[PDB]
């Protein structure tokens with residue numbers, strides 16, 4: 001997240017860090033005790049048996065007792081098309097079930113097909129790059145953003161910060177976009193580099209996939 005701020009510790013207990021031996025590479029959202037959802041592009045060309053699913057985290061630089069770590073048992077995809085940038089969503093079934101507590105909670109999703117109007121106010125978040133050569137965040141970051149339909153496709157939810165350069169960035173992929181308390185987006189792609197101040201950020205539209213999500217987690 002470029003131009004954001006530190007989240008209050010465990011403000012967003014559905015927030016997940018996906019990690020390899022090397023550490024954080026993508027976000028995800030806890031959608032049931034034994035399922036997280038993320039961007040398909042996070043796991044294309046990754047060894048999924050090596051992925052650690054880290055719940056309950058805040059400061060990735062410290063050891064945190066609040067954390068629960070799982071492995072990935074199964075992957076569900078839904079037509080990921082990297083060439084057209086479509087269907088950038090994947091569900092990862094965990095090798096166990098999370099212990100739901102103050103720090104680890106499942107997110108609420110929208111109704112199937114629910115679109116967001118121009119001007120809806122959301123929060124983006126992630127442990128991604130803070131900006132040019134500032135590296136990934138240690139502490140979870142959040143950012144006020146605004147839904148825009150201009151310079152966006154119908155197959156995405158797009159957001160833009162007006163009046164300054166701020167937005168999601170590498171490492172934020174797969175992270176939730178929270179709008180009116182519901183997970184309406186999964187961070188998918190940027191244009192013109194991160195925080196261009198020109199192109200809106202693009203998210204997979206969670207509302208378009210709710211029936212499919214339910215078929216799997218329910």
Ligand SMILES: *[C@@H]1O[C@H](CO[C@@H]2O[C@@H](C)[C@@H](O)[C@@H](O)[C@@H]2O)[C@@H](O[C@@H]2O[C@H](CO)[C@@H](O)[C@H](O)[C@H]2NC(C)=O)[C@H](O)[C@H]1NC(C)=O
Nearest residue numbers: 012120121122123124143144145146177178179180181182
């Ligand atoms: C900056 O964003 C915060 C948080 O956004 C809200 O909560 C998110 C989880 C998500 O649901 C968004 O869609 C929401 O808009 C805003 O904080 C809220 O502000 C209102 C009005 O001042 C306040 O009454 C609420 O209690 C706040 N909600 C929460 C959850 O803290 C804030 O307004 C945004 N600021 C700007 C200028 O856009």
Ligand SMILES: CC1=C(C(=O)OCCO)[C@@H](c2ccc(C#N)cc2)NC(=O)N1c1cccc(C(F)(F)F)c1
Nearest residue numbers: 041082085086088168169170172173187188189190
């Ligand atoms: C991170 C990545 C790509 C990437 O790994 O592709 C490699 C795939 O092999 C590539 C991309 C290609 C296809 C899709 C789709 N469907 C999505 C993204 N384009 C891209 O913009 N990012 C990127 C950069 C900064 C922030 C974010 C965000 F998710 F928004 F947080 C994403």
Ligand SMILES: *[C@@H]1O[C@H](CO)[C@@H](O)[C@H](O)[C@H]1NC(C)=O
Nearest residue numbers: 052069070071072094095096
């Ligand atoms: C799930 O994977 C984690 C991380 O490797 C491991 O600690 C734990 O034993 C596993 N839980 C199971 C198999 O129930």
